[PDB]
Amino acid sequence: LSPYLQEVAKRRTFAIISHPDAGKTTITEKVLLFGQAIQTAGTVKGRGSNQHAKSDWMEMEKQRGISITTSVMQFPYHDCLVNLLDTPGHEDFSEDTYRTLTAVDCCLMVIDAAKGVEDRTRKLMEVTRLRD
Amino acid sequence: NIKSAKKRAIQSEKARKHNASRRSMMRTFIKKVYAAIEAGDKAAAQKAFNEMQPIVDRQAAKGLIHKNKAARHKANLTAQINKLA
Amino acid sequence: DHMLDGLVEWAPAPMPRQTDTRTVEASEDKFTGFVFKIQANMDPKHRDRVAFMRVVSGKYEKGMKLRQVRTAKDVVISDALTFMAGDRSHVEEAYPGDILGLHNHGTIQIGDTFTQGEMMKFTGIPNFAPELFRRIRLKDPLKQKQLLKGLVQLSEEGAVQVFRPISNNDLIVGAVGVLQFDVVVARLKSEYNVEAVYESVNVATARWVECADAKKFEEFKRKNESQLALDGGDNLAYIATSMVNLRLAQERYPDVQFHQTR
Amino acid sequence: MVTIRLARHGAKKRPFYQVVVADSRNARNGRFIERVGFFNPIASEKEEGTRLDLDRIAHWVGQGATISDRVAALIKEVNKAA
Amino acid sequence: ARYLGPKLKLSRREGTDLFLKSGVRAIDTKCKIEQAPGQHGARKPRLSDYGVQLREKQKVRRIYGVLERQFRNYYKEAARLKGNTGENLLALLEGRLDNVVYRMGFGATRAEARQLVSHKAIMVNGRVVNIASYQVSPNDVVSIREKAKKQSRVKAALELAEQREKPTWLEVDAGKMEGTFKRKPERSDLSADINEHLIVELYSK
Amino acid sequence: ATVNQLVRKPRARKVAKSNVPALEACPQKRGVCTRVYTTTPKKPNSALRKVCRVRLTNGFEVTSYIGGEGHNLQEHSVILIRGGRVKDLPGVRYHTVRGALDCSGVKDRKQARSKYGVKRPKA
RNA sequence: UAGCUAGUAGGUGGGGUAACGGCUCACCUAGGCGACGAUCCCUAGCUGGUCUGAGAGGAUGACCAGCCACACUGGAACUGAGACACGGUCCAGACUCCUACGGGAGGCAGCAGUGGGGAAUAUUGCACAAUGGGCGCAAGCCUGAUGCAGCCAUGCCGCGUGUAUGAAGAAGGCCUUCGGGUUGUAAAGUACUUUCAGCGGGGAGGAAGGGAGUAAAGUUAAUACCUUUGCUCAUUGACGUUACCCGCAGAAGAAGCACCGGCUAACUCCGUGCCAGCAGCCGCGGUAAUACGGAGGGUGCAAGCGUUAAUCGGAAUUACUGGG
C-alpha cells in the first residue's frame, strides 16, 4: 500500500475525439470551470479565496474560431488528476490523433444529432478498434 | 531583483535611521556650541564643549566618525573658544 | 458536471504499452516518455520544440538524466514544463501518468524512445505519406532566412515536411492534408514575415523517401544529377513527378536499409 | 591579503603552474607583485622538474603572506634536510 | 600533401634525373627523357631569370618531396642560423628523417622511405617516429623494429644501396638494419649538381 | 628642405580615398537590385553590357555589372554585390556574385567554376 | 574655430573630505588661459603590444595582461576600510507582463539561447576532478571564472589519400606533314605495406590534498584535548567509448581549386565573330583568337584554392634619414 502506486491509480487519460463542429473547445473550456472551479474548490477552503474576475458583460461578448492543433490540461481537480489532450478534428487535420490516441488509454466521443454517425466517426472507430 | 541576499537591504534600512540619528544628535550638540559662538559667553562655550567632547569621541569610537573629522572639530572649535576667551 | 463522477468511477489504471520485447507496466522504472508531436508552436521569443511524453511508468526527478536511445547519448534534462491550466507553468515534478513539455532545439523527431538503459523501441508512428501541394516563391524577396530556417523549423513535424530542390528556388511545402492555410496563417508571426500566396503547380505523388546503403547510391546520385532534391532532415527521396519515374526507380534496384521517416 | 598561489598557465591539456605572490582580490592570471619559482605537474623524471627559491618565500612569510595548500605541499617537497 | 602522381614526368619536366624512379632497375630510358616533357615539349622556351629560379626551386623540391609552405618554413629556419643560408637550407633538407632512411638504403625510392617511416617501422633512439619531417639530431641511431623487420621490402631495396655512392656522413650496419647518424654534411658532398643560389634569389625577393 | 616650416606645419601624408564606398571596409554587400538593362560601353568596346542599379540595404545607390551568360533578373531577386571596378562602364565599380542569392549560377560551365558559382559536374 | 572665462584667477576667514584643494559659502583685487593653438566642432577608450618595414616611420591595439568608464536613460543618497554600486535602494521617463484593475514585476554591454541588423560569427552541454575567489577551526557548500566537451578548414602546423615492378609503349580523348606524337609507368596485371578512419582489448598523466587509525615530539597538573611529522587502511576524474600501445580485415574510406599574350610559371584544336564575353594594368574579340566558351595538355598551390575588403612595403609618388 505504497502511496506511489496509489497515486499512479489517480492519473487517468481522456483521448477526446469527435466530428467537425461538435464542441471539443466548449466542453474543454467548461471542464476548466470546471477545472478552474475544481481549482476554486481546491481554493475554496483556506484563509482567503481568490478567483479571476467572472468575465464582465462588456468583454464577455468577444470570440474566435476554426480550432486546430491540440491543448493539454493537467488539472488540480479534487479526487484524481486526469489529463486532457486536444486535437484538430477534420479529415485533412487530425494526423495528430492517429499517434496520440495511442498515448491515451480511454476515449471520449462527441456526436451531434444533426451530424450523426459519419465517415469521421467511422475513421475514428477504425482507429480505436485496433487497441480496444 | 529576486535574490536570497536582500537581507542587507532592509538591515541597512535598520541602519539608515538609527546610526544617522546618532549623527543627527551629534551635530546638534556641535551646533549648540556654535550658538555659544553667537552668544559670546566663554563659560557657556566651555560647558558646551565639555558636553559635546565625550559624545563626539564616542561617535569617533563606534566607526561612524573616522577619528580625524572629530579631531578637526575639536581642533578648530578649541581654537574658536580660546580665541574668544 | 455529471461527467466527472464517471471519469473517476469507470476509467482504470493507465495500461501497459507494447515494446519490441514485452509490455512495460506502470509500476516499473526507466521512464518511457517518447515524443508524440513537435507541435506548430506559438512563439513568444523562442521555440522549444515541445515534448509530449508517455511518462506513465516512473515518478519524476528534478535532476534526472535521460538517455536518447536512437542516438544512444546521456542527455541531462532538468527543465520540464507542466501544463497547469494551459499555461506553461514553472519547473515542476509530478506523479507518473502525466504528459510533459521539454526544451529541444532541432534534435528529437517523432517517436524517439527514452529509457535508462533498455535500448528497445515501441510500436508507434502511424504517420502517413503526403500529397504534394505547391511551392514557396518568396513574395517580398528580402530576408529569405525566416523561411530558410522557420519553415525548415516546421519541417520536422508530422504535417509539414519541406522539400528543397537543387535549383535553390521553388521550395515545396509538404502537406499530408489538403488545407495549407495553417502554414499561411503561421507565416504571420514574430519570426515569420513572408506571405507566399498560392497558385496551381503540379508535382504529383508524395516523394517516397529512400536512402540506400553505401558504395551503391553514389552512382545513383551521379547519373541523374539534375533529378535530386534535399529534404527536411537532409534526405533525398528520388523526385516524384509521375508514377512512371517511380517505376524506373524500382527498375534501377536501390537496395536499402529502409527507414520511412513518415 | 597577499598570498602565494598557483596561476595555471600552459596549453590546453598541458598544465604549467606559476607559484606567485599576489593579492587575493586579483585574478588568477591577473596582476601580481613578483614571481618566484614554478611548478610543472606533468614533469616526469628528467633534468629539471621544479625550481623554488625559498629566500623570497621566507621574506613573504616574514611579511604575512598566507600559504595555500599546494604551495605548502611544494614547501614540504623541497625539504630543508632532504 | 603527397603528390602520388606521375613521378617520372617530373624528371622529364626538369630534364635531370630527380631519382623519383630510382627503383631496383637501373637507368630506364623508357620515357624519352630530355626531349618530351609533355605534349608541346619540342618547343624551346625563352627561359628567363625567374624561369630558371622557379625550375631550380621545383627541381630541388620534387627531389626532396617538400611542399611550398613547408619549404618556406625551412628557409625561414635556415635564414636565422649561423654561417650562410645556402648550406643551412640543404642541411635542413638532409636532416629530414625520410631522407636519412633513403640514404641508408631502407627502400628503393623516397616515397617508399616516407611510407616506411609513416607505418610505424622506422625507430630512432628507441622512439618510433611517424612524421617524415623529423629533424634528425646529430649522433643518433636509426633502425627498424623487430615486428616490421625484413619482410623482404627492405631486403632487395638494400641491394640498391650496394650501387649508390654510400656517403660518408652516415653508416649502415647491413646485418641488423641499424643505421648510425653522424656530423652534418658538407655542401661539396651532397649530389654536386643542385644550385642553392637560385633558391636564395627566389626567396629573397 | 626648410625644416623650420616642418616644425611649424607637420608633414602630412595624403589620405587616398577607397575605390569602393562600401561603408567602413566590408567585402560584400546585399541590395534590392532594380533596373536591369544593357549599356553601351566606352570607346573601344561596342558591346551590350548587362548592368543593374542596385539599391543597397544601407541606402547607397550603386550600379553593379552582371557577368556571365544569362540571368533570371526582373526588377527583383535580391543578390550579393562584390567590389572591383570593370574599366568598361563609367560609374560601374562593382560586380554581381553568382552562386549567391536569388540569381542562380551560369548554365553549363566547366572551366573557372570558383568564379560564377558553378558547381563541380556531378555526372 | 581667434578670442575664451564671472566661482573665473588669487588672497583672508567659516564649513566640508580618511586628506591638500573655490571642494563649498562671506569679504577684497582684477586677474587667468592663448599663436610653442586658449574656447568650439568631428572622431576616438588608453597602454604594454600586433602587422608591415633594413632602419626611421605608417596603420592598428581584436584575442593575453594593467588602468579608466559603463550596467534600459538620468539624478540622488545609505551600508562599509573600500560603491556615490551588473545580478543593492528610491525617484523621473520609455518599452513589455499580470491584476480580483485598489497596485505591483522586469532590466542578458554575464554564460547559454531568440527576434532585428548584417557578407559575417557557436551549445538553452558536464563538473568543482585541479587552480583561484567567498564563508566556516575543520569536514563540507557555491562558483556560466575556470578545467573541459560540441560546432565552424576562421588561422597555423603535421599526416594520409599507397609503394616497388610493370610496354602491347594496350583501350579511349587531343593534335597531325595522318609518318607519328601526347595523355603515359599513367591505367590494367603482379608482389608488399597500412599512417589516419572502422572494430575489439589493455592503459598512464593532469592527484596535490582531505577522512579514519597508530607512534613520536611540543603544550599543560595531565599518558586527556589541540598543533606538527613519519607511518597503516579505504579512497577523491567532467574530460574519458582519454593520450598512448597491441590485434582483425582489406589499397581497402579519403584531391581538389586557380591560371596558361606580357608583367608572372605554362601550348595547341574546335565554336562563334567588336557579338557572346574576359580583364589587377597594357588591353583582345571586326570569320585562321597562344587573351571569350568547350576539349586535350601543362603550370602553380594543396585540404585547401581563387575573388572581394583593410594595413605596410615596393612608394625616395609627403623626402628627419631620403625630393625639388
Ligand SMILES: Nc1nc2c(ncn2[C@@H]2O[C@H](COP(=O)(O)OP(=O)(O)CP(=O)(O)O)[C@@H](O)[C@H]2O)c(=O)[nH]1
Ligand atoms: N447551443 C449550443 N451550441 C453548441 C454546443 N456545443 C457546441 N456548440 C456550438 O457548435 C460549434 C462547435 O464549436 P467548437 O467548440 O469549436 O467545435 P469543435 O469540436 O472544437 C471543432 P473540431 O471538431 O474541429 O475540433 C460552435 O458554434 C458552438 O457554439 C452546445 O452544447 N450548445
